[PDB]
């Protein structure tokens, strides 16, 4: 079949098809996740309030395991194919090992698929970056991040999508270690509206607890945005 | 072969004989019928001598590769499921092996049992082999959950002996292990003929 | 199409592998124009006769044609009809639903009562223009 | 044998402008009744009705592949399948698996909606086509049905009096067969209507 | 036609404190005839410290001796000239007998060598590779003559007497001649001449011995 | 066949019962092994057979229902869609390399409306199956050696309008007949029930 | 063939079917499954049709010759022992017959059962034949020693019926007898299809 | 083999126990059938096997002991003379036309001095037998599927100086092990005993 080498090296030791796949993520929608003491929250951008979108509310953060959920940034068609490989891997794991899959195991599989598309004939890399959060069987909250080069790394507060470096350098000087549940949802809002416009119908946040995952609805999200919007006015008043 | 093992308040005790007979001829008398998989698991042997020593060496390779990739120990619920998926895949190939896995994972004890046909069962009390039918009647009479460490070692060593005495395919040197929370220790290792003049002097 | 999981659904399909659910959508020439005209009037509690009259009226807008012609317009509706091929006697322990969904395509005798309501609704919004 | 494992007899007769088809209601495992209210007939349109006998695992698997192929025929070709095209279609299905063969024996009855000609066909398990103009029959009581149908048939029958012959032929043959019985479900069908009748039988 | 055939003969080995004595008679025979009296194809050298000594079918013996011969050579090429030990060869033997489990060899094997410490250990195998380290071993048609004999004079069991001192190379060799002169009397498929191999750390010396010709 | 499965459906519940015996040719390994696998929150299957194919068939069915709820956003499929997926795995295995599954099973479930547009089945569902791939919806189904003792018992005493307690004392008669005539020692029977609120493990009848 | 008979306070009730099938073809539908031996004994037939009708005609000859020589009636303990010694003598000759004898001798009733292999057992409750396994579960549920004469006739007629409905080798016309102290009387003789619209209208 | 016989002899008694199960390939005909035939006033035999040869062998043995007491003026023969007469009927039947008896039996008895000149055995007698014609005097013998469960139980707990009550609670352990591991439902065991005053039917252990 067609297996010509696409991902090749530059004369400066760079991979052009990987550096150009990262540029497709930097135009994707921003997704921010932070790590607390008993909960994991991840918030995505949820392109717009189109008024033409279905009244059936469409989730952006996809379910992969019973406790491990995933949010991405990049091409939304490439990410669907990547997750149905990972949703097929969880049922391969609890058919050969009788166990619930760890969070660090699923990220090593998805990063193994990202790297496998960077070293194949006829294949471009996946133009997606993922934020993966979930708990183990013994609590222990986790938060991970894969890039189109295939490098997995666990984070304490991670942001992907457009303006990647802008959020991460902001929330590394405002992060408090060991937050409660209400502090994580409040901290994921104030990092995500730094980049997205001030609209209230373009945040989709999710709170991960042990055997309990609760999506925030319309009116519950209104309670946390106003507490952030009144505080960023105080942050501007603190500068002047 | 008369391998047995039971689970009680204090861990798991594994007890075997050491005899391999190819019919009416005794091939050997010092066969290790417990392959220690690693320093917290055990595996036992019954049936074909090569079918057990091969696939529990394959099982000891899949448990070592688990610790390399995932950085942590393998459970026993994952360890037998590796051995049961291998065994069920070759169920029409005429294998003959009946193996117990016993170990201390992070959920306490667990004593499983794998056939040569893909079965896996979870109890606290087994006895496998051709002479195992002799080892049930002396063990079921004296088993209780809250035995002491010394009395359950005595009940295991005495329940092997009454089956080695009666079955032609069983005997040799009774080996008793003890699976506690830190791993396993070889408790005793003694001849069956020396053990006759202790129990009936 | 209709399923028993979420009822009547409508999807798009992009030539990249991406899809999205919708309540009204446009593909082809002037799809950016026909989105805004469907956005101006779409509400939830809408009947099929109010939806088919919405469908023909936006179609005349993009191809700038008053008096919608029937030779240049193709329509098809996806609703549930009462089930007629129920056979309980050869299936004693099988339950048949009451009404079944039927994809159909309207003929010229079926679309002429509906095309003469879309120009009049264009004419009803024409006398109140100045 | 594998063919008489599940039990059940399906037959069909041809009339003037009509045909009948009738199966029993028994499902079993070589002596014991599993169900008492299970027909063997299948209807694909208002002209073709076919019945399967043989092994019940193959009676359901083959009838899923037929419904997979009949509904795909209606999507490709914008029309209902005809009787000569349906009978020659699943003749080819039983011949592709000739060395791994299905254990069904389909009894096909069909009619032309506009012309009014009946078409009967009963293949073997290996797909042997055979179209008699009088009657077809398969199942465990098939040897008893060739005596009942041949001694009672005439070519010029009304739909009301053809039902009376096919019903007395099924029941009298199932009173001698210990793998078929427990009533019968029949279906008379003309150019104008389809009438489905359930018949009293011995509960033995 | 049957693709399996027993070609008689026997092999026996007794391992000492820094040596192994390895023996096997030179007699090939078929259906009812006698093919040869001088077959040296019964004991094969793999490394200078480890031999294999197999018998049973002569045709599958020569095939197993060559596949064992080149897996040692791929070991020597991939490890920088390092010669494999007895424990490495005898686990290589135990796996390859199981890789052909469904069309197996009609051979019965013994891997005979020295330890890393210098002590000699003999292993034994069934047709599918059941291994065990042990101090002696006897395979072949006359195994049921010699293996109970080696139980009675090496283990020193059921004899209320103090233990003799450690056996030398000479007292082991004169003992093992008493078995092959005993198997030549009572086994019809065994005995024309037995060849003794004495594996020591300073090379190997090789002797021969005469048995009964009938 | 040494172990029996008994299941009957009524107006608002489906009883199941499966003897928890596991043996090695005459030696009782267990007496309490659960052989009624909870597939969904409203669906279960009572498989009989030896313990080799029985776990490996039920784990393949259960992990694929859960996968079809992952890919379809947690939408629970009907009981007929699960039962037709099961006999597809029996029928495709009798004409394969590895051989037929030697499992005999009784599928049970309750159909709830998943949305307001669902106008399907409201009542209970009970399906007889076989190792070959036979599928039959039946008022009551039985497997094992004691099946013929208790299928003619349910010919006598089963009624479509039995209550939760009247069918509970019927299942007690079903368990006491197998203890009376079958030579195989079935002493503990694991009675479960499927109702509109999910599955429930009945402690009383054993 | 389904055939049962039970013993209660008031005598013995014998209940049978009337069907003879050669595999999947039904040979006949009016077979008398009960051969009355004399006016105080009964015998049933199951298995081979000719093996039963021969040796229970031989049994009816040895019971008549008993009364000629000894001047008195034969007991049931002597009548089955005639049939059991005949049966045990031909146990390797491939016979297939399973028969119950029932009667009122001078020691009350007794209900026996003879194999084709020489067995003879003494109980109060039997059900023999291929569809016997259906007739146990409806009978063991409703049996008690002190039934009335009408209710035990109802329990026997209803227990045959649920076996004829389920077994392919059983059916026809359910015949119920009653063995009281003066002999036997034919209670009822009714079709199985007519008996379906009585028990399930 | 589906039914077990357990017998052990002690200083002044011989216990026997035989499960009263009679079956038809899986269907329990009885649960209380006496399988321990009282041959003499001090002798009994616990035969196992199917019910065909089992009655016809025991009636041939019992009627010939009684005939040898008719012709010898009521003089009761020894237990070894009865046991050697039994295995003569097993050994001559494996080389005959009709075939071998498929009975496995345990002979038991007590030897009393019939006169003042008798200086023979005073103690109890217990003989293991087989269907071929093997005869062995043994401290305890067992047949059936559960024999190997209880022969190694009597390796553990049997003592030559057991009393009437200590051997009675040993036989209760012998009956509870067969109910625990054997798949065959043996629920009633018919314990009898042979002492110096004849045979006795023990009601307690069942
Ligand atoms: C949970 C449980 N409960 C029991 C009672 C068992 C059990 O027994 N499971 C089992 C499974 C597979 C096997 F393969 C074996 C097994 N063990 C053997 N030992 C010795 C010989 C033998 N040896 C020398 C010569 C001849 C023979 C026949 C043969 N076998 N076969 C045993 O499992
Ligand atoms: C005390 C007791 N408990 C039970 C459960 C029994 C019992 O069943 N005893 C028995 C003894 C001898 C027999 F010969 C039979 C017997 N009955 C039959 N009925 C019908 C067919 C048959 N018919 C048509 C086609 C094919 C077949 C195989 C065959 N047989 N064989 C039954 O006795
Ligand atoms: B135990 O007695 O089963 C024991 C098994 C242990 C070594 C894993 N050994 C044997 O008895 C087996 C018996 C056997 C079972 C099934 C098939 C063939 C044999 N013996 C051997 O496998 C054997 C034979 N020859 C040499 C070495 N081992
Ligand atoms: B019943 O089905 O057992 C019945 C009882 C008999 C007294 C009429 N027996 C038969 O129907 C037998 C079945 C059978 C059993 C065993 C071996 C062979 C057949 N059938 C006949 O004996 C028979 C044959 N031909 C005509 C009539 N009956």
């Amino acid at each position: 079949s067609y297996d010509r080498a696409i991902t090749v090296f530059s004369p400066d030791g760079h991979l052009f098809q990987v550096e150009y796949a990262q540029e497709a993520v930097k135009k994707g929608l921003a997704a921010v996740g932070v790590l607390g003491s008993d909960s994991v929250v991840i918030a995505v951008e949820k392109k717009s309030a189109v008024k033409l979108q279905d009244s059936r509310t469409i989730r952006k953060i996809y379910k992969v395991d019973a406790n491990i959920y995933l949010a991405f940034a990049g091409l939304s068609a490439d990410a669907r194919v990547l997750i149905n490989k990972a949703q097929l891997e969880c049922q391969r794991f609890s058919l050969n090992y009788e166990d619930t899959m760890d969070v660090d195991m699923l990220v090593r599989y998805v990063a193994g698929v990202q790297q496998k598309s960077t070293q194949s004939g006829g294949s471009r890399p996946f133009g997606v970056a993922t934020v993966i959060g979930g708990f183990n069987e013994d609590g222990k909250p986790h938060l991970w991040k894969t890039d189109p080069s295939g490098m997995c790394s666990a984070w304490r507060a991670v942001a992907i999508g457009r303006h990647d470096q802008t959020v991460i350098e902001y929330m590394e000087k405002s992060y408090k270690d060991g937050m409660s549940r209400d502090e994580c949802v409040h901290f994921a809002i104030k990092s995500l509206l730094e980049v997205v416009e001030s609209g209230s119908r373009n945040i989709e946040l999710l709170v991960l607890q042990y055997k309990e995952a609760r999506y925030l609805t319309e009116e519950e999200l209104q309670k946390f945005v106003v507490e952030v919007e009144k505080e960023r006015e105080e942050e501007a008043a603190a500068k002047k | 072969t008369t391998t047995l093992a039971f689970r009680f308040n204090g861990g798991i005790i594994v007890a075997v004989d050491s005899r391999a007979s190819t019919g009416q001829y005794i091939a050997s008398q010092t066969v290790m019928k417990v392959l220690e998989i690693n320093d917290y698991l055990l595996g036992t042997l019954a049936g074909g001598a090569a079918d057990c020593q091969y696939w529990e060496r394959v099982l000891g390779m899949e448990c070592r590769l688990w610790e390399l990739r995932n950085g942590s120990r393998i459970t026993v619920a994952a360890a037998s499921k590796i051995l049961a998926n291998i065994t069920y895949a070759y169920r029409n190939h005429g294998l003959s092996m009946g193996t117990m896995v016993a170990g201390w994972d992070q959920f306490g004890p667990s004593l499983y049992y794998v056939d040569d046909k893909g079965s896996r069962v979870k109890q606290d009390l087994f006895s496998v082999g051709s002479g195992s039918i002799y080892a049930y009647g002396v063990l079921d009479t004296g088993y209780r959950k809250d035995l002491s460490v010394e009395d359950a070692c005595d009940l295991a060593r005495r329940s092997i002996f009454h089956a080695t005495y009666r079955d032609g395919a069983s005997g040799g040197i009774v080996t008793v292990y003890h699976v506690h929370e830190k791993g396993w220790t070889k408790i005793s290792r003694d001849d069956q003929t020396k053990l006759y003049h202790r129990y009936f002097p | 199409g209709w399923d028993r999981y979420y009822g009547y659904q409508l999807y798009s399909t992009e030539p990249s592998g991406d899809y999205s659910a919708w309540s009204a959508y446009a593909i082809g020439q002037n799809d950016q124009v026909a989105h805004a005209l469907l956005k101006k009037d779409w509400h939830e509690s809408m009947t099929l006769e109010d939806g088919m009259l919405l469908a023909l009226r936006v179609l005349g807008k993009t191809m700038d044609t008053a008096k919608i012609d029937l030779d240049r317009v193709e329509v098809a509706v996806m609703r549930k009809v009462p089930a007629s091929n129920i056979d309980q006697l050869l299936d004693p322990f099988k339950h048949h639903p009451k009404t079944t969904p039927r994809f159909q395509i309207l003929t010229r005798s079926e679309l002429k009562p509906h095309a003469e309501r879309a120009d009049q609704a264009r004419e009803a919004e024409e006398k109140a223009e100045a | 044998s594998i063919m008489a494992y599940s039990g059940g007899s399906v037959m069909a007769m041809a009339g003037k402008e009509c045909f009948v088809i009738i199966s029993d209601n028994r499902l079993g495992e070589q002596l014991k009744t599993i169900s008492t209210e299970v027909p063997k007939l299948h209807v694909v349109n208002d002209s073709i009705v076919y019945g399967l006998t043989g092994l019940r695992t193959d009676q359901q698997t083959f009838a899923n592949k037929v419904q997979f192929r009949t509904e795909m025929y209606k999507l490709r070709e914008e029309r209902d399948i005809t009787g000569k095209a349906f009978a020659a279609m699943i003749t080819s299905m039983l011949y592709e698996a000739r060395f791994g063969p299905w254990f069904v024996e389909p009894v096909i009855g069909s009619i032309d909606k506009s012309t009014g000609e009946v078409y009967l066909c009963a293949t073997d398990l290996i797909g042997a086509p055979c179209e008699p103009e009088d009657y077809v029959c398969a199942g465990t009581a098939a040897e008893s049905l060739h005596g009942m149908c041949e001694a009672l048939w005439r070519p010029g029958m009304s739909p009301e009096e053809l039902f009376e012959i096919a019903a007395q032929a099924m029941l009298s043959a199932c009173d001698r067969d210990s793998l078929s019985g427990y009533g019968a479900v029949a279906m008379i069908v003309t150019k104008d209507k389809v009438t489905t009748r359930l018949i009293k039988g011995r509960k033995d | 036609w049957s693709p399996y055939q027993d070609n008689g003969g026997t092999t026996a080995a007794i391992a000492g404190k820094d040596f192994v004595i390895l023996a096997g008679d030179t007699r090939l025979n078929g259906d009812f005839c006698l093919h040869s009296r001088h077959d040296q194809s019964k004991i094969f050298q793999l490394t200078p410290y480890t031999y294999m000594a197999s018998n049973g079918m002569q045709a599958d013996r020569l095939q197993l001796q060559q596949m064992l011969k080149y897996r040692v050579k791929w070991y020597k090429y991939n490890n920088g000239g390092k010669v494999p030990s007895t424990k490495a060869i005898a686990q290589l033997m135990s796996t390859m007998l199981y890789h052909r489990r469904f069309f197996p060899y009609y051979t019965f094997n013994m891997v005979v060598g020295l330890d890393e410490e210098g002590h000699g250990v003999c292993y034994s195998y069934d047709a599918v590779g059941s291994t065990e380290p042990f101090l002696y071993g006897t395979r072949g048609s006359a195994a049921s003559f010699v293996e109970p004999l080696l139980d009675c004079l090496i283990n020193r069991q059921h004899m209320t007497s103090q233990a003799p001192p450690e056996m030398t190379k000479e007292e082991t060799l004169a003992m093992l001649k008493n078995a092959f002169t005993g198997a030549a009397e009572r086994d019809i498929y065994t005995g024309d001449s037995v060849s003794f191999f004495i594996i020591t750390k300073d090379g190997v010396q090789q002797e021969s011995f005469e048995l009964r010709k009938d | 066949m040494a172990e029996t499965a008994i299941a009957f459906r009524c107006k608002d519940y489906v009883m199941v019962a499966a003897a928890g015996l596991n043996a090695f040719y005459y030696i009782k390994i267990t007496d309490a092994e659960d052989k009624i696998t909870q597939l969904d929150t409203h669906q279960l299957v009572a498989c009989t057979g030896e313990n080799g194919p029985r776990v490996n068939f039920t784990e393949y069915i259960k992990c694929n229902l859960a996968l079809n709820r992952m890919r379809q956003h947690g939408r629970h499929s009907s009981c007929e869609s699960t039962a037709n997926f099961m006999r597809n795995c029996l029928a495709s295995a009798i004409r394969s390399r590895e051989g037929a599954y030697q499992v005999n099973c009784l599928f049970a479930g309750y159909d709830t409306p998943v949305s307001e547009d669902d106008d399907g089945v409201v009542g209970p569902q009970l399906f007889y199956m076989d190792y070959l791939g036979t599928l039959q919806a039946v008022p009551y189904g039985c497997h094992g050696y004691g099946a013929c003792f208790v299928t003619a018992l349910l010919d006598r005493l089963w009624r479509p309008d039995l209550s939760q307690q009247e069918g509970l004392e019927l299942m007690q008669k079903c368990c006491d007949e197998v203890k009376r005539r079958v030579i195989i020692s079935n002493s503990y029977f694991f009675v479960k029930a499927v109702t509109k609120n999910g599955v429930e493990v009945i402690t009383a009848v054993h």
Side-chain angles (χ1 to χ4, degrees), chain B residues 1 19-22 27 31 33 45 47-49 96 169, chain E residues 126 130:
Chain B
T1 293
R19 186 171 175 181
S21 67
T22 174
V31 176
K33 291 181 184 175
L45 282 79
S96 178
Chain E
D126 56 354
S130 178

Side-chain angles (χ1 to χ4, degrees), chain A residues 28-220:
Chain A
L29 297 176
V32 175
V34 302
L35 184 64
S37 179
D38 288 330
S39 67
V40 174
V41 298
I42 47 175
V44 296
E45 187 170 357
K46 189 177 70 67
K47 178 73 70 67
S48 179
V50 192
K51 196 182 176 182
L52 193 64
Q53 187 59 249
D54 197 3
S55 295
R56 181 175 66 88
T57 308
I58 300 300
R59 295 292 189 267
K60 181 70 179 295
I61 297 168
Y62 290 159
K63 180 172 184 180
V64 181
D65 199 359
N67 51 4
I68 300 166
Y69 294 179
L70 193 150
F72 63 92
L75 276 76
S76 65
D78 292 331
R80 188 266 312 275
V81 180
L82 183 65
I83 292 168
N84 290 118
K85 292 183 183 293
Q87 291 180 356
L88 194 277
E89 181 64 28
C90 293
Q91 303 301 108
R92 199 270 302 163
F93 183 74
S94 69
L95 194 68
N96 200 5
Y97 294 97
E98 204 187 5
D99 290 330
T100 63
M101 195 173 181
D102 289 330
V103 182
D104 63 355
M105 298 182 72
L106 190 149
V107 179
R108 289 193 298 269
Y109 182 74
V110 175
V113 174
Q114 295 293 108
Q115 194 275 128
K116 192 174 181 180
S117 67
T118 60
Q119 203 178 4
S120 295
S123 298
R124 70 173 185 266
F126 290 100
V128 293
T130 63
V131 166
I132 298 170
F135 293 178
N136 288 322
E137 194 174 1
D138 55 358
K140 192 176 179 179
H142 290 289
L143 183 66
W144 290 88
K145 183 256 184 67
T146 63
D147 51 353
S149 69
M151 185 272 287
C152 63
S153 67
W155 288 79
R156 196 169 66 247
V158 70
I160 59 172
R162 65 183 183 180
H163 292 169
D164 185 79
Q165 189 63 41
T166 304
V167 181
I168 296 171
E169 71 183 2
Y170 180 76
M171 66 182 178
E172 70 181 3
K173 64 180 73 174
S174 67
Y175 183 79
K176 301 285 102 176
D177 191 358
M179 291 179 183
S180 65
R181 188 261 176 195
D182 290 332
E183 294 180 355
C184 291
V185 52
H186 187 272
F187 187 73
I189 292 296
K190 66 186 289 184
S191 296
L192 186 62
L193 52 80
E194 185 180 3
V195 172
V196 75
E197 68 269 15
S198 297
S200 296
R201 293 180 66 189
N202 52 4
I203 296 169
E204 183 176 0
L205 194 146
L206 172 59
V207 178
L208 286 171
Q209 291 179 356
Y210 185 76
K211 293 184 184 294
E212 180 68 29
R214 183 173 66 188
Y215 292 97
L216 272 72
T217 181
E218 294 292 329
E219 70 271 14
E220 290 180 354

Side-chain angles (χ1 to χ4, degrees), chain F residues 147-159:
Chain F
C148 297
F149 293 103
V150 71
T151 307
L153 191 147
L154 294 175
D155 280 327
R156 173 68 179 90
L157 294 173
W158 179 76
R159 290 184 289 113

Side-chain angles (χ1 to χ4, degrees), chain C residues 2-9 80 97 99, chain F residues 113-120:
Chain C
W2 182 78
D3 53 351
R4 66 178 177 87
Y5 290 163
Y6 297 114
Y8 295 105
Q9 301 180 5
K80 290 170 94 288
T99 59
Chain F
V114 67
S115 66
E116 68 270 15
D117 289 329
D118 195 2
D119 59 355

Side-chain angles (χ1 to χ4, degrees), chain B residues 1 21-23 46-48 96-98 113 115-116 121 126-130 132-133 136 169, chain F residues 24 27 29:
Chain B
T1 293
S21 67
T22 174
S96 178
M97 57 181 288
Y113 175 64
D115 280 330
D116 55 351
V121 293
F126 295 106
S127 178
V128 303
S130 179
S132 69
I133 51 181
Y136 285 114
Chain F
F24 187 79
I27 296 98
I29 298 169

